[PDB]
Structure formats: structure tokens, C-alpha cells
Amino acid sequence: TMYIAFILSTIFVIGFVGFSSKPSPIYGGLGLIVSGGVGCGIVLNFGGSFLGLMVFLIYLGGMLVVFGYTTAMATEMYPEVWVSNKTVFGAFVSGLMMEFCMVYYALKEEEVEIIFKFNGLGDWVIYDTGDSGFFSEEAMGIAALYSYGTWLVIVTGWSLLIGVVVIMEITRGN
Amino acid sequence: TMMSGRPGRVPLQFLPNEARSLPPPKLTDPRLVYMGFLGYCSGLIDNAIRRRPVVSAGLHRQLLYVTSFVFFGYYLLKRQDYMYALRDHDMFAYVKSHPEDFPEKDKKTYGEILEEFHPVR
Amino acid sequence: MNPIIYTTLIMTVMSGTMLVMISSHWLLIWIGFEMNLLAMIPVLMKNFNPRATEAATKYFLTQATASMMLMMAIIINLLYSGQWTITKMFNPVAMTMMTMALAMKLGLSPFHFWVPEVTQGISLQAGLLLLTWQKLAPLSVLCQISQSINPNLMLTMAMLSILIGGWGGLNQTQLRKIMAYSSIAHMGWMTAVLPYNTTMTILNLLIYITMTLAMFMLLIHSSATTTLSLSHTWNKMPVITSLMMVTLLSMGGLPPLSGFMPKWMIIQEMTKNESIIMPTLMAMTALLNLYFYMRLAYSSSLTMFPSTNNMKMKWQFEHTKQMKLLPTMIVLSTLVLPMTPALSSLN
Amino acid sequence: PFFDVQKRLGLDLDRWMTIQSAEQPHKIPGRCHAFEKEWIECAHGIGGIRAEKECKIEFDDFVECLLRQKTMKRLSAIKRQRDKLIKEGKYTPPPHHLGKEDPR
Amino acid sequence: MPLVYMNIIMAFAIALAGLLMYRSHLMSSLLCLEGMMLSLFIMSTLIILNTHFTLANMMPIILLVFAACEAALGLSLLVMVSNTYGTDYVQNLNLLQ
Amino acid sequence: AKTLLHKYSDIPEGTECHRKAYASTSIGGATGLIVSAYSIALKPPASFLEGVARTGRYTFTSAAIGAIFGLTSCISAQVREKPDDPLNYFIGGCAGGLTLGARTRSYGIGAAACAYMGLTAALVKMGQLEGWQVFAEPKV
Amino acid sequence: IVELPTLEDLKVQEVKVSSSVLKAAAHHYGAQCDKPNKEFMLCRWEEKDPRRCLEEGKLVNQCALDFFRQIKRHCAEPFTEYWTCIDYSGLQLFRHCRKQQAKFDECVLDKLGWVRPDLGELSKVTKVKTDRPLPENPYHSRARPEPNPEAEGDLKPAKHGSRLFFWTM
Amino acid sequence: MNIMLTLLTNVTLASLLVLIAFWLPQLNAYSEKTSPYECGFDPMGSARLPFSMKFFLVAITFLLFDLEIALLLPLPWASQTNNLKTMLTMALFLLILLAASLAYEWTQKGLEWA
Numbered sequence A: 001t002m003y004i005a006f007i008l009s010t011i012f013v014i015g016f017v018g019f020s021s022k023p024s025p026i027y028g029g030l031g032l033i034v035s036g037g038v039g040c041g042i043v044l045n046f047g048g049s050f051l052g053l054m055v056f057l058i059y060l061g062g063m064l065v066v067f068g069y070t071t072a073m074a075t076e077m078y079p080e081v082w083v084s085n086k087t088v089f090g091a092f093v094s095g096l097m098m099e100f101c102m103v104y105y106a107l108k109e110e111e112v113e114i115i116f117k118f119n120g121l122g123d124w125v126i127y128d129t130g131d132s133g134f135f136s137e138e139a140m141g142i143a144a145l146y147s148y149g150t151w152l153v154i155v156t157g158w159s160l161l162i163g164v165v166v167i168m169e170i171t172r173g174n
Numbered sequence B: 001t002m003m004s005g006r007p008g009r010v011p012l013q014f015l016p017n018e019a020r021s022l023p024p025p026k027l028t029d030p031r032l033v034y035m036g037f038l039g040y041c042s043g044l045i046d047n048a049i050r051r052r053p054v055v056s057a058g059l060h061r062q063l064l065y066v067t068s069f070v071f072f073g074y075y076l077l078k079r080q081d082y083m084y085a086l087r088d089h090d091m092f093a094y095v096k097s098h099p100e101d102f103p104e105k106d107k108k109t110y111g112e113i114l115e116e117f118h119p120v121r
Numbered sequence C: 001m002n003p004i005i006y007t008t009l010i011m012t013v014m015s016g017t018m019l020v021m022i023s024s025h026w027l028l029i030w031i032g033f034e035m036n037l038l039a040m041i042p043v044l045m046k047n048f049n050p051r052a053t054e055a056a057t058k059y060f061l062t063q064a065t066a067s068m069m070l071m072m073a074i075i076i077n078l079l080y081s082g083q084w085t086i087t088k089m090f091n092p093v094a095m096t097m098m099t100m101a102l103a104m105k106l107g108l109s110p111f112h113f114w115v116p117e118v119t120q121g122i123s124l125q126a127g128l129l130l131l132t133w134q135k136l137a138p139l140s141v142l143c144q145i146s147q148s149i150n151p152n153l154m155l156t157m158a159m160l161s162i163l164i165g166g167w168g169g170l171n172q173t174q175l176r177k178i179m180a181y182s183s184i185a186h187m188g189w190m191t192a193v194l195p196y197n198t199t200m201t202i203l204n205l206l207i208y209i210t211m212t213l214a215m216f217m218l219l220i221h222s223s224a225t226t227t228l229s230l231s232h233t234w235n236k237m238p239v240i241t242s243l244m245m246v247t248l249l250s251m252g253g254l255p256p257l258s259g260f261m262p263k264w265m266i267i268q269e270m271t272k273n274e275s276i277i278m279p280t281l282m283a284m285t286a287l288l289n290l291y292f293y294m295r296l297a298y299s300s301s302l303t304m305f306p307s308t309n310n311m312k313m314k315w316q317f318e319h320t321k322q323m324k325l326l327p328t329m330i331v332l333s334t335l336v337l338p339m340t341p342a343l344s345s346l347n
Numbered sequence D: 001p002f003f004d005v006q007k008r009l010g011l012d013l014d015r016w017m018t019i020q021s022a023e024q025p026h027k028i029p030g031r032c033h034a035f036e037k038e039w040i041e042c043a044h045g046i047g048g049i050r051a052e053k054e055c056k057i058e059f060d061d062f063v064e065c066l067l068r069q070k071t072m073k074r075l076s077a078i079k080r081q082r083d084k085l086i087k088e089g090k091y092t093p094p095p096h097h098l099g100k101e102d103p104r
Numbered sequence E: 001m002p003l004v005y006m007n008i009i010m011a012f013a014i015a016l017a018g019l020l021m022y023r024s025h026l027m028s029s030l031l032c033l034e035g036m037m038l039s040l041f042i043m044s045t046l047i048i049l050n051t052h053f054t055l056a057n058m059m060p061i062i063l064l065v066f067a068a069c070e071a072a073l074g075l076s077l078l079v080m081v082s083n084t085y086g087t088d089y090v091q092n093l094n095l096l097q
Numbered sequence F: 001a002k003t004l005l006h007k008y009s010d011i012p013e014g015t016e017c018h019r020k021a022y023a024s025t026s027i028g029g030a031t032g033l034i035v036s037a038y039s040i041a042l043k044p045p046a047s048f049l050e051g052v053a054r055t056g057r058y059t060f061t062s063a064a065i066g067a068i069f070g071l072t073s074c075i076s077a078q079v080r081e082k083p084d085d086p087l088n089y090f091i092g093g094c095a096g097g098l099t100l101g102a103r104t105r106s107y108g109i110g111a112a113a114c115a116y117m118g119l120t121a122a123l124v125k126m127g128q129l130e131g132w133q134v135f136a137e138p139k140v
Numbered sequence G: 001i002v003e004l005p006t007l008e009d010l011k012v013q014e015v016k017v018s019s020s021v022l023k024a025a026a027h028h029y030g031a032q033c034d035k036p037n038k039e040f041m042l043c044r045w046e047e048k049d050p051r052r053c054l055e056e057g058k059l060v061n062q063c064a065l066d067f068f069r070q071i072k073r074h075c076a077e078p079f080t081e082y083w084t085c086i087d088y089s090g091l092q093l094f095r096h097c098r099k100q101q102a103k104f105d106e107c108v109l110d111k112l113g114w115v116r117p118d119l120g121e122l123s124k125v126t127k128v129k130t131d132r133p134l135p136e137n138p139y140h141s142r143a144r145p146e147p148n149p150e151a152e153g154d155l156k157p158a159k160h161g162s163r164l165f166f167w168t169m
Numbered sequence H: 001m002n003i004m005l006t007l008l009t010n011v012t013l014a015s016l017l018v019l020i021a022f023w024l025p026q027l028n029a030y031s032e033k034t035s036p037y038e039c040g041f042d043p044m045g046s047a048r049l050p051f052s053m054k055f056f057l058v059a060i061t062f063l064l065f066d067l068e069i070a071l072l073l074p075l076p077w078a079s080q081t082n083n084l085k086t087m088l089t090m091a092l093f094l095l096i097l098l099a100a101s102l103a104y105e106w107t108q109k110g111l112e113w114a
């Protein structure tokens, strides 16, 4: 078909190719933006929409901004673009050839020999009937977190709280 | 892991009611009194580290230590005997469970068997 | 940082490990480590030094990447068996990574390089706690996944931890780095026998913790650090140097002493498995481990390095703030040898 | 030391989240509930070790339930077969305009 | 396993190799780590969407939380190291690898 | 991979010395690449050409050691025609050190390498003869 | 190799009323057609295999057909006056029309004469008699492998105890 | 599809505005005209390090609230669960901790913002 989810996976992976190469944190922040929107799109394709919008909100709408603060604290004059060094750009190309070899393996249509077998063909094939009443599986699925899963709520509450305490006990020391 | 995960039994209880039936260690089991002296010497080092006039001082606390370790040493001995008695039991039950794999081998005598002799030279 | 907060941190570390020791679901284990981390970093940052900061940077950076690989390998396990219960793992490519992640969490070689450094960066309080309490949780999960471990992979790190735990121990002066190589060496002995029989592991664990409690309480008691700094102590409070000697020998596992109990059960267990060669190499190298305990003993109690004059006034002043738990931690870590059989209490 | 205090005290605070079945809100079925149910009913007193022998078949069917691995290798073999016949065969006319829309 | 999963896993492998090739100022590493986090998230969520294993719909978000949480911590340490230098990994006080 | 040692394992006996020697050369090359890998990893060569010089060094050396070891072993097998006793490897073991002795241009290191590499190899053969488990399965 | 019903044997003339029209009157449809219906679903959830209950799955079709045949001869113009009102909304919400339902429900309650169920009524689970056996093992499944013995006696003291190494007792 | 189509038309629209923005005035760029603005007089140096603890000291707190609201989101749907008393405590609980966290910051003087 469109293979649209899969090509999104490809743009995702190159999003990590330009991201995992390390050319000033700001451009890497761009890398996680691209990989971020691609991510939420990909998970949206299975219809877990609420989650894809969590990451598109909580992650990218949160994190990469605070990184857009760290660079204000780090920067250094003349930050490097991807093209600005032989090892960085060499690295980016180094990612591209590999992932392209994977796509060529997709052209081969044979199961992947790397690491462990990748069964091949289109993504749609694994889908099953999504039949349900006037509610998505996800909705009540996460709604369950409160009523039906109090324990996790306890440890997350406690954890985040004392994480705030830790931020205090690091920054105040100075 | 063995023993752990054994059918029946419950996790955190230190000591099964299934024990109890085993005789308790007697009051002056030498292992136990050794727990005594262990506590004793610990009580003594407690003085020596903190200067103190060793031995005569704090004879009080020293008595606390020896009573402490002998006390815990007691129950620890009970669980010891319980555990070993347990593995012995499971072992014998299993040897009845599979008689075939634990053959009652016939015992030929020395007259019956040949064995090579090696002269010392 | 006021004690009321410090204690909440340290208690949430205790909780952050207890949680690993309780929960059966994997996600709560990864939460167990994860909560453990956040609560572990700040306590390294008390007093705060330009040095300590990069110490914590090391520790966090490695623990974070370890936890990452771990969660990845969990997810792969789920992908190929749809489970969350601990139990056996069902895909070797995942299993080896869970072994790796835990291998960082113990600090086993060749992942080990962070541990000698981090220890250098913090005070002996935070140090001791790092070398004992942090060693619980990852072992607490390894005991649960002993059933399916790929023994080859485990024994290789288990040995190499002992060689590296040796050679890197002969070289250093300041004690904290040495304590680091001691622990990094004992973990080789714990994680070695793990595929074969976990109860021996937990035994060895208890002895190790008791031991390093003995040492760090002593170093605290004398506030020694660099070897020379330790050397002066023979004249001021002779007893405690005269006791570091012994606890060191119990590290060395000279046979009357308690520290021999681990090795000598381990050698038993592995020998039932045949595998006769491995314990021989292991036991031979443990000697090499002993030798720098001995040299360190020479700096201290057996021989008197020259005293500095200024020491004399210090003679008038008794040490204070006694640490109650100490004497028992010495004695248990030494005299207990004719109480091996009690190990079966651990079933 | 897998302390299992949650079991001795019966708190169950963790246990619910485990397993494909095990009561889920609005009783929504797992996609592979059945093979899983059979496979677990197979698993009790057998405990862990012998369990990887005797219950293997059940776990296998459960595996294919999870990944649909084999049915995909097959279905792939068919679709790749069809290309060879693409000039030798014209497949099926209805797919294009059959009673499938009348079918409901 | 369908090729898409293989692709995300590979994105993980790159999200690790990038962390470990590890160069210059370390802020890049906190990025690469967060990228790693994101790949694990997505790889989890696709699965929970797959088998309709509904309870586990709660996990990915919870995963996300702590993971984001530690990263949130990480910057703070960087601050301190940035505080005395203007950050670079190239400068480390500690001895013996 | 284990398949490679498995390749070397089917000697058989010592027949066709080349077939064996190629495999030993392969193993020596592998270990050479690993040692070179960590060496580069932990001793930042500075100027990458020097780094490939380094790896060329170690790789070629270990490959050489494996080659000469393999062929001297099999030749001794095909000449003494004993051919199964452990000493049959030991010469090659002793030979191997000399190879290592040549590249290092030192009598000392070559001399020690002769003895210890020899004893190690002898123990290996002895082990194949005796099924020593090195990494025994949990069994217990 | 899997058993399947012939392409024909399944075949039945379809209900072909549109979904909006269907919904407009379904609220009565549950009230009238019923016994075949619940027999059907109870038959389904028993053995899970559809083929087993496919025939009842025919019977329900024809039953519904008879239902609409009863409809068309009587109420229809009021009926069309009703579902036309409803199909106009893409939410299919009942609240938007309602008033026509006065027309329709009255013309039925008189001219064909029987009541509309109240809102709290259809949801409740219904008792249903059935003659066919409940299936032996619906999962088919296999044998349950023999459990390890939970054998026990009583604990005599260890034969010499702590037999490891030199310890005597 | 639907949404991807509107994304494409929007982005292409904007990019079109960019291209008609540059390739149109068709006049003379030159140096010093292109020099960065600095209220007349030339800059004393390119932008460097406007460092402040008072940035992260709060911004991090932002991040740890945003993670919290991420948990608040399930609430509207969770409200319809069959057993609210099991839920309701937690519904309050996190908010308390949210507040609690803030409260802790409120008075350790960690919230100096600015």
C-alpha cells in the first residue's frame, strides 16, 4: 500500500542519524523534533492517538525547550553544523548507508539476517479486528491507571516529588 | 534455588509450624555457647575501641551483648536443624519416588572380584 | 542539607531497593532502579566539591545508560513472549543485554572503570553506602534470573572481574581507590557462582557487606585516606590500626578467618559441577588480591611510619560520636568461621 | 532475594498488571487470550523446569498468536508465488466488483 | 516480526552508538540518551497497541515519566559542571579509568 | 563466532596441514583485531594513520602466530605420526613464542613466550583428550 | 486442511435496510424479536466457533425479515417520517428528532398494538432455555500434565545433620 | 488522507510565501548593511553566555510539573470507572503532591524565578 507508516519509520531513523551524530546540541534538538513528530505520527497510525499526542506534547513540547535553555548555558562561539566536521558529517553518512542497506533488504523482501529475523512485507498485515463499543481500547485502557492501578500512582508521585527535592539539593549547594 | 519454591510453605515466616516437631537444641549446645563468647568478645572490643578500662568497665553492656547474640543464636540454630532435617526428608522421599534410578546394587565380596595389584618397587 | 531531608533521601533509597526486592512485575523493578538512582545522586553531593561534582557525573552517566539498556531488553523480552513476570527470559539476544545492564549495575569488568573513580570523589560515608547498599538490588534481580543466564557470559565477566579486581589493586596508594578494587574483585566471586547455586552467592554477599562495613567504619574512626595518612595512626589509638590488620586479613581470606568461608563454599559448589579448572585460576588470583591488603597492612600496624610532631596535642583528645554498630561488624566478619553450617538457614 | 511479601500479606498490589488476561477493565479480551489461558492452565505444579518441555506446544501456538510469524512466512510465499503466475494467471474477477458489497 | 519494529530497534541501536561515540561537551549525551528513551517508548507503545493487552496501555506513559524524570535531573549536574568551566567532557579531574 | 572455532576443530587429526593452518591463521587474526580494538579504544593513538599502523601491527602479529602454530602442529602430527599425544602441539606452542619473539626483536620475551605458550597449548590438547569443561553447565 | 462450510451453505438473503433506518426501529426490534436472538448469542459464547452457530445465525436473519414484513404493511409513512428525521444527523442521536417517535410509537401501539421498552430494560441479562448440549471442552485443548507429588510424612531429625565437611552436629 | 493533506498545503503555502519574499525585491545586499544590529554602535562581541542558575532553578520545576500534568490527563476518562472510591483518593493524591512539591519549593527559597 502506501507503506506510509514504514516510510515514516525511515524518516524516523534518519532523524536519529542526524541526531545521534553530535553537532551542537541545538541541531540535535532539531533532530528530536523531527524524530518526535515522525514518532507521534507513527504511533498515531495504529490509533493509540492519545499517546502519540502525549509524546508530541509532553516530550517535544517540554524537553527540547528546556534543552533550548541548556544551550544558552553552554553554546560556545561558533557551534558546528553537521557539515562543519569530517567526523560528524562522516558519521551522518555512516548512518545513511546502513539504514539504506536496511531499505535495500526491504527490497530483497527476504527475512532479515541481522541480529534476529525481521519477517518482512507490509505493516498492515499484523492488524486484527478493532471491534468495540462506543469506546477506544486506549481510553479506558489508560483510565484504568487510577482506579485499577493505584500502586504505580503512589510510586510515581513519590518519585517525582523527591526528584524535585533532589533538584533542590543540587542547585542550592552552590 | 532448591528448597525455596517448594510446594506448600509460605514465604516470609521465619520458621514453619511444620518444624516445632523437631527437638529444640538443648540449652548448652556447644555451638550456642560459642555464640555466647562471640557476643562476649564483641562486647569487649566495644570497650577497647572507645578506650575504656577494658573488661571491668561497662560489665553491664557486656552482659547485654552476650545475651543478645546467644538469644538470636538460639533461633538461628532452630532454623538450622529444621532446614537440614528438611533436605534429608525430601531426599528420602525422592529415593522412594524413583527406585529405578537408585538401584539396589548387588554386593559382590572381595573373594568374588578381581582387582589389579601394583607392587611397590 | 538538613538531616530531616537527608534522612528522607536515604530512606527513599532504602525503599528504592526494597521495591526491587518485593515486586514481581518487571516494570516495578525498572522503577525500583530508577527511583534508586535519583535518590542516590544527591547524597553523593553533600559537602560538595569541584571534584565531587564530576564524580556524580560519572556515576549518573553510567547508571543511566545501564538502566536504558535494561529497559530495552525487557521490552524485547515482552515482544517475544508477552510477559511481565520475572521468570525465564525467552530470547537470548535480549537475555545477554539484561546481563550486560546488570553487569554495569554491579560494576563488573570490563564495565568496571567507573567504580574506582567514583569512589575517589566522595566521602567515606557516601562511599561505604555506595559499595554496599547499591550492590543489593542488581543482585536481587540476578538471583531471580539465575534460572536462565547463559553461564559462559556470566563466568567470563565473573573471572575478568577478578583479574581486573586484582591488577588494578596493586597500584594505588590512597585507600578509597583500593577499597574500590577490593569490592570490584569480590563481585567477581559473587557473580561467579551465581549460575550454579544462588545461596552461596547470598552467603558471600553477607560476608562482603559485613567486611566493608568493618573497614569503612574504621577509616571513619581514624579519618585516614591516603596511605600515609593511615600510617600515623599507630601512635594515636593503636587499637584500631591493630584491628585494621585483622579485618584486612579477613578480606584476604586466610583460612581461620571468616572471609575464607565464602571462597571455601564457592569452591565446593563449582566442584560439584566439575568445572574444576575455573576455581583453580580464580583461587590463585585471589592471592594477588590479597597482596595489596598486605602491603597496606605494612604501611599501618605492623610497622611504624615516622610520626609528625603536631600529633602530640591530638593525643589529649578522645575520639567522639561513637558508631554503635561497629564492634559487632568487626566480630561477625572474623570469628564466625565455625558457624558456616548455619548458612543453610539461607536455604 | 525474591521476597514475596505482597503474597504473604495478600496485597496483590502488583500482580494484577501481570499477564494478558487476569481481569481487565470492561472485560476487554486480550488479542491472544485463549492460547495464553490454555498455556497457563497447563502451568502449575509442574513448575518452571519440566514446564519448558511438556507445555512447549501450547507456548508455541501462543507464540504464533503473538507474532503471527509463520502465517506471515506462508502468506508471503503465496503472494510471491502469485507474481510467477501473473502472466500465466488472471486471478479473480469479483475482488474488483463481486458480491462482497452485496455480501452484507 | 514486521519490518517496522526492526526499524525502530535499529533506531535504538543508533541512539546508543551515538551516546557512546560520545564527544566534546556532554550535553549531546543527554540528548542522545533522551532519543534512546523515545525509541524505547515508541517500541513499547506499538506493542501494547498490537495485542490489545489493555492494562499495559498505562505503562508507556509511566515509562516516559521516570525516564524523562532522570533526564530532567541530568541537566542539573551539567549545570554544575558547566558552572566551573563552560562545559566540555574533555576536562575530567578523576584519575584511573 | 563459535562456528569458526568449530571450523578449526574438525582438524581431522592433522591431515592436510594447510586446511588447518588457514583456520589457525583466522583465529589469530580475530584475536588480533580484538586486541587492536581495545588498544585503540583505551590508548587514543592520535593521528588516525598511526592507529591503523597499530592495528596492522597487532593483527599481523597474532595472525602470524596462529599460522605458524597451526602448521607446525599439524606437520608434527604428520611427521611423528604419534600423533595424538599433547606434546604434539607443544612444539608449535614453543614455536609460537619464537614468532612472537621475532616481531618484538627480543630474546627475553621470545624465550618466556616459548615456554608459557607451549604449556598452554599442551594443556589445551590435553583438555580435548579429557573433556575438561572449563565452563561447565550448571548440572549440579 | 481446516474444515470449512461450503461457499453456498452459508448463503442467506441479507437484511438490507440502511443502518439509520435500522436504528430508528431497532429499539422495538429488540423488544419483539428475541428468543432466536438470545439463543443465538448464547450459542455463540458457548462454543466459540462461529460455524457451530451459523445456522441460528440464519434463523435470526429470517426472524428479522419477518419483523420488517410485519412493519411495512402497517406503520411506514409514520415510520419513514421518523427515520428520515434521524438519518439527517450524522451523530444518529435520538435527542434530535424524538417528536416523530410519538407518531411512530403511537401508530404501532395502536394499529399493530404493542409497547416500546423503557430505557432501563433491554440491558438486563436474560435467562434462556436451550436443548443442545453445552460443549465438552470449547477450547478443545489437551491433557493437563500430571502434577508433581505433594508427598509428605513427618520430620525425623536430620540423620547426622549439617553433614557438610567436618562438622559433627 | 485528511490531516496530512492540510499539513502539506499549509507548509507549502508558507514556503511559497518565503520564496516570493526573497526572490522578488531583487536589490543590492552588501557588507555592513548585513552587519548585525546593535542599536547603532558595533557589538563588543558575538553572543556568548548569559548564564543564570535562576533559569534552570525554576525551568526544571516546569519540566517536573509538565510530567505531572501528563498524568493528570487520563482523569476525565478515569472518572467514569465503575469504582470511584478506589480512584478518588488518587485523583486527589497526585494533586496534593503536585501542590506539595510546589510547597516545598515555595519556602526553601528555591523559587526565586526571574
Ligand SMILES: CCCCCCCCCCCCCCCCC[C@@H](O)O[C@H](CO[C@H](O)CCCCCCCCCCCCCCC)COP(=O)(O)OCC[N+](C)(C)C
Pocket: B004, B010, B011, B012, B013, B014, B076, C129, C132, C133, C143, C202, C209, C336, C339, C340, C342, C343, C345, C346, C347, D001, D002, D003, D004
Ligand atoms: C547503610 C549501610 C548499608 C547497609 C546494608 C546492609 C543490609 C543487610 C541486609 C541483609 C539481608 C538479610 C535478610 C534478612 C531479612 C529477614 C526476612 C527473613 O525472614 O526471610 C525469610 C527467610 O529466612 C532468611 O533466610 C533468614 C536469614 C537470616 C540471616 C542470617 C542467617 C545465617 C547467617 C549465615 C552466616 C553465618 C553468620 C551467623 C552468625 C550469627 C523469608 O525468605 P524466603 O521466602 O524463605 O526466601 C527468600 C529467598 N532467599 C532465600 C533466596 C532469600
